[PDB]
Amino acid sequence: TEEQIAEFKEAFSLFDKDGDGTITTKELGTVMRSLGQNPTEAELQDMINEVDADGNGTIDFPEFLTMMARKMKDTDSEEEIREAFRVFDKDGNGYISAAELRHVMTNLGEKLTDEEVDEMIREADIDGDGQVNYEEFVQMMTAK
Amino acid sequence: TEEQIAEFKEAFSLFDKDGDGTITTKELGTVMRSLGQNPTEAELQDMINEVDADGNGTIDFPEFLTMMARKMKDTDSEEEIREAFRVFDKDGNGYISAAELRHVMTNLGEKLTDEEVDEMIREADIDGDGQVNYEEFVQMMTAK
Amino acid sequence: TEEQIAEFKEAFSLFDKDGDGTITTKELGTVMRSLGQNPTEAELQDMINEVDADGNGTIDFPEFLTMMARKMKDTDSEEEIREAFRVFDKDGNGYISAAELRHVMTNLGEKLTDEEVDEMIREADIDGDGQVNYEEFVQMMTAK
Amino acid sequence: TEEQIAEFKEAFSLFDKDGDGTITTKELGTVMRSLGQNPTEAELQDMINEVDADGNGTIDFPEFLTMMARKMKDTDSEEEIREAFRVFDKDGNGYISAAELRHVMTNLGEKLTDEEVDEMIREADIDGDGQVNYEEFVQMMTAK
Amino acid sequence: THVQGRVYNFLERPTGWKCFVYHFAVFLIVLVCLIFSVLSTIEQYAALATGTLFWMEIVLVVFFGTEYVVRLWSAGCRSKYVGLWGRLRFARKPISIIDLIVVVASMVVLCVGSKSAIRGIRFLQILRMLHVDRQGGTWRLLGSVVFIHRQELITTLYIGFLGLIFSSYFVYLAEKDAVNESGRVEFGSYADALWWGVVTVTTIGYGDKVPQTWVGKTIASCFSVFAISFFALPAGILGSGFALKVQQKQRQKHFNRQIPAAASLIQTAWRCYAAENPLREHHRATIKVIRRMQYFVAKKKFQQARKPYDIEQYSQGHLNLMVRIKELQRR
Amino acid sequence: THVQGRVYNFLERPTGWKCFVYHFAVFLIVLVCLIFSVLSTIEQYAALATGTLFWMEIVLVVFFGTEYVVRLWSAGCRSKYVGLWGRLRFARKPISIIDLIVVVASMVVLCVGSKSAIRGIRFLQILRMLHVDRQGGTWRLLGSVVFIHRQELITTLYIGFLGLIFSSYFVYLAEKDAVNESGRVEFGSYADALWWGVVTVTTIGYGDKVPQTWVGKTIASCFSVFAISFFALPAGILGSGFALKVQQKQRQKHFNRQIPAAASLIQTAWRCYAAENPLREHHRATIKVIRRMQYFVAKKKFQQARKPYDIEQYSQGHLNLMVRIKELQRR
Amino acid sequence: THVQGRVYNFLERPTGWKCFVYHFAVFLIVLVCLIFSVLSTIEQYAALATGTLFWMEIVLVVFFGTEYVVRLWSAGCRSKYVGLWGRLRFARKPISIIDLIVVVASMVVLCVGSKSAIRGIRFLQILRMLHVDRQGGTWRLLGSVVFIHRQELITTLYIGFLGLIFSSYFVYLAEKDAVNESGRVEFGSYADALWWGVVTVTTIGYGDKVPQTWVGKTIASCFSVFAISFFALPAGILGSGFALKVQQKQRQKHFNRQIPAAASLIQTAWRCYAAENPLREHHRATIKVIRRMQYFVAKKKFQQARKPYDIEQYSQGHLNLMVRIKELQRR
Amino acid sequence: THVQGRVYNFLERPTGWKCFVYHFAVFLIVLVCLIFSVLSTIEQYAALATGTLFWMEIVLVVFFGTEYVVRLWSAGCRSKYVGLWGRLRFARKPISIIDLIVVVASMVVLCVGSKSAIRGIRFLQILRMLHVDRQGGTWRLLGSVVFIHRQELITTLYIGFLGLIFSSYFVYLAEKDAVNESGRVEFGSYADALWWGVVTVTTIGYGDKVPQTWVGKTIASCFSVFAISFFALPAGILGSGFALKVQQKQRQKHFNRQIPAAASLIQTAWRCYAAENPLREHHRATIKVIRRMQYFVAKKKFQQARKPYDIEQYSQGHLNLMVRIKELQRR
């Protein structure tokens, strides 16, 4: 609990390239470029805009530990995720086909790894039929 | 039961400044001013309009004991109160935040005591999260 | 069972003033006038129109025993009766007041006996409050 | 299981008038004419269009065994069938009368055998009343 | 008595062809009198209609006076028009006031003209056209639909009038001294420009006044377009309002029809249920089946009343939802 | 026979380009005959069209007579038009009556004119334009939409006519003696003022009659505005009614299409289920798979019939509600 | 103080007959000044209004200057108009700018004309008509409803203008040399044809320019029909938009009314529930019943606020669905 | 390359003020050229614009030729316009065909006129006005809304045309020999009566032809009313259709915006869940929090996309139903 918070604070200081408790959006972008995930834009700007409760650009962990504290399995997120699946489903259809799911997953938004797409299809769809209910998918996604 | 009705009749006669079983709207306003709660208007007029079943302005307890007899926990009142909370809640939201609840409670209608607002927030919201379901609030309000 | 059908056939022949198995709409009106319930119109015409399956005006009990055979408690009648109460009830109100029920019962359609109205109010409304649910009324009406 | 698939493949080859694994739409029409059920049109064209997954007109059982594999009792078919009964039913009516059911069954689409219509009416309607619920009909139809 | 009620039904709130014939006849006679009033001033058939408009006028006067005094006699049926004060408040109605005014004025003109009779009778012959629509079923609809949309009409008239004023002033400024082809000047004053503006904005366009200078034509075109499109607005608003208001009235009428059926059904069902207790036995043998008969009749009438939907096919917005809710309740 | 049915389909209730070509051709020929009737009285090309309107007329007469007698021969298909009384009641139809009248009148005029032939033929050439729209698919729509809104149209026409009468009388009163610029008097009678009122209220505004005195112009302006806005009402009402009625007809057509699919689906499903019992075995080996094939075909056709929504995107009023109810039922 | 608030309420955002009288009076006085401006140039009553338009003008100027300086004094109530910069930003408003401009210009004209005073005062007398509608409650509605439908208006105006250009060019090409009955040529240039096009397309139809050759009349007819029907579109769009926008504003107002009731109800209910703890006993004997009284009052007010539906009968689209859901919840 | 894509975005499918300026500028220049074409035939400023319409014309020709060849160079971005056949099918588009026609015709006219140059250039200057609206975003809307209501427009035009024909024939029959005040006869032929009918029915009302006999005026009044009200129908139908079609397009655009948000949300949520497995540890210390950051960003964007309702307040038809269903599901 507290050890994880301290380790995350140390990692944030390391990414900030300084011992100060600052977000350091430019240092965060540099660390992202070092991680191979070159942002190529000011994505860190909006990220901090959502990650900085006070909007200071760099604060002594204003909501970073609080960001972690967001359960990420709370019903206020499972509802949103289930609504996100509703965009691809017909009236009371659900069961969106593995083919359509793979298609929308790789050809839209940002493309994921093809093997990751196949792994997700195998994880969600176990019966093997062309029917993967969105409820089971969101249930396992917000399960653990 | 009967003792409470007799005591309330005696208190109504005392507020009426006479032993007659009269509402005495002017005497009621005088007693309210004596209670510190200066009405400053003819609020007693509408009060009696709702409290005088026959609209006589002064009657021998036409519905005063009946006013008491209104359970105040009957479903015909809990439904109205739950509808009153719906004004401040988004679609299927509920869980109106303690901040928003305090804001609307003190800055609208007639302002209550700030400590009373904090006490109500503590009573309704026990989990401490920014989610106080209106159902639990109305349940305790009409509970006892 | 069969004895009741035979007795009803004999009574229908007696009302028809002849041993023939005929409806005898004119004889039916004469018998109604003898019963004090003077029809004063050709109500028997429409009655037979609904009571004569073949519309012959006089047939050898075409659906008279079948008219009896209508359970009169079947859901296809309780639904219609519950819809009939809905005309007098506000949105999700039910519980139509004894005063309003007596008013609509005596001042509309054909007036019933005042004591019959009071008896119906007492039968439907047992708790004594101004709330007589239509569901309980139709339940006892189609009960037996 | 496998024996049934092999026997069906042999029967398809026999209908194709050749040992080749071909649909042979013209041979299928000839076999239908031999079965007394003269198609009289290019119905086999659309049949194969739905029966040939690749639309080749003649393939080595592309989805024939898969066509069999369609459970025909899956909810994705019971839902469609229950929706098909909804066309003939009033608002929340169900219970479509044996008379109306026989009428629509023999005078519309392609007429079935009159004795088959009576057998279906007897199978679906067991209580004998003019009320045959569509739910029970689809339940037995997709039961076995 | 039934006579007074039938008479009141025949005179006010008419229904059926039996009253339609009478009202259509009186209206046709009024219109024929009016057409005789038109030809009485054409100066080429004047002698043909200058004299008959006295005998026809006195005949119509006697007829309408009889109709008035008869419809007055039917005030006993109304719960509020009983008594002398009741007849007084009946005569207080505006349509009855108009009828009385027409009657007395026609009588006075007929009396004085025979002691130029057409000179004054024409305006009365106009006012007779107004007493044709009884119960005021026309003006109330218009009043209601204008009062509902009382803010859109005001703003569109305000914008149109402002455009009219400003643009007509600019036109007058641009054409204050310019002579037409016939040798006269058109926009002599500012009132003449206002007349041009009121003729152009409403798209009448007589053609007596047309701008001449190239600076007048531009303003005329801009005004014509941008203010015709704003003065032509009350057509759509009032039309949609009329349609909606008539639909609301029809629905209210149907729902007021539905109530007697439900009342009869509830009463008859309760009477049928209490078959236990209201030679006193042979009579009880038939009361049961008669109660069953009237109960079946009541169920038939109630099903016949709740059957219509009044536009009839209005359930398409809630077709699948209702059946889904019903089958959900079944489970 | 199939011949009579195909002929009846080609002549009445046409569908497809194969019949569209024929109907468009006959209509174009009728319109060309009418345009020849226009130029036959211009007094500058009269000799060019005074003679051809006999040969063209007799050609058209023979053509339409053949078409009439052929469409008469197709009365055997109709269940109610079989028999001699059936052909009689077919000829009882109004459009057929108009066709017969045109035929016999053209024949009689052609016979008498050759024993001034254009003098009478023009009104027939007008009436030929009416037989172009078969089945009366135009007048029924208008009749229905006028009868639906029969109360708004009556009240708006009544108000407009009352305003017309009163305002035109006041204008005549204010201009009874006033001379225009050309030296004549405009509002000579009251009928002339009525003509001015009917020209102003409908916003035609010819310009033959314009008020002159300052008291005439005010009333003219007030009438123009407040009665143009009331006579212009039938446009919106009838337009919304037309749109709504066509939508209702389209929905009824789609729903009548839906039924055969459901019937075939139910029948085929029952046939597939009763695969137990209808060398009698080798035949039974293929009846099962053929029943499965036609069952799949029926499911395809039924899904294709219930798929369309006919305006297509009309589910936005019940989008979230339906999915909420569905997922509630899932639980 | 209450004085400043009452004054601001009486001057801006008026409500009630007490302010209606004042605003109607000032508007009637402005309109009477304008009517005096009309008669001041008729050249037949000029001497009657050439002098009074100085005394009346200075009276109106003093009145409006007083009204302006008084409404300026009421800027203390507004939270954003406090302070000198607050008064400056209040004067920054457009309507106040127009009022100040009118005031200073009237003062300057009155000063210079007495040291032809009507020559310049008329345009000011026009602009006084604009300061009548306070808070700009008229132009905002029109702006919003035009901006909402900003794509249909643009396309209809574009199509209409294109038809106008092309058809008027073709008409000019077909009538470039043709003399009318009066001996002059009408379509002298291409601008004259454009004038004819703008007069025909908007259906004004003056009658100064009419095509003559048979090839001109055909194009004139086709253009008139197919472009009148396209230039007449903004009427319906703007009308439906106005109605819908006013309905939205009314609903928003009703919902903003609903909130204080709910707040009072929640607060009073919580106060009634916590009757345990806020000679200190005799006072507590009546606080309970007074809390019950105000709670009943709050329930009454809340039921009275949620009772209206504002068009009132709008529940017919969800009548049976709601009762079905309610009874389903009951089970 | 990015250059070709940016150029194609700037030339076709423009968005933003940076392209708005360019398009507005080119349109203003085209309109100024057209206004120079108007004044070039007024015969009073002809010498001022008879010569500049050559230099300005060649400047515009060079400009538009450059614009055409540059927009041709941007065909590589389109997936279907790659290759020489791709450029050919790009040039196959109608708007590009019009642009090429204008270019080559302007070039040819400039070459021949300098070897009366205005005589032919005016019709080209007209056609330049059409290349202003790119992507054909105007004509497709009109085509769709006319094709949707293809049955109401046909029937109203048919009824109007039939009334026109019959009533104008009757008017011609009633006025075949009658002389006006100026000494000529108006309804000389039947084509003249047809011209009167087309001028009256569309409510233009020039005033060159007015009926004279009392039997002509009655038919003229009846026709004017009962056929103006039928020819004025396409305004309302097309208006409602335009509004509805634009609403449908806006909803489709919003829903096509919604999809990328949902895709990003699902993908990011799955990436966050599979935090088990994609010095290889220190890197894994920050990938988790970065995934959480982008997940929060995705949730924010998705909530921001599903938040709008596009007319915004459209939930009043299902307000209480949705909350009732939600609370029912809660239980």
Ligand SMILES: [Ca+2]
């Ligand atoms: Ca740092």
Ligand SMILES: [Ca+2]
């Ligand atoms: Ca910060």
Ligand SMILES: [Ca+2]
């Ligand atoms: Ca007292």
Ligand SMILES: [Ca+2]
């Ligand atoms: Ca009292």
Ligand SMILES: [Ca+2]
């Ligand atoms: Ca008998």
Ligand SMILES: [Ca+2]
């Ligand atoms: Ca019978």
Ligand SMILES: [Ca+2]
């Ligand atoms: Ca084969």
Ligand SMILES: [Ca+2]
């Ligand atoms: Ca194949």
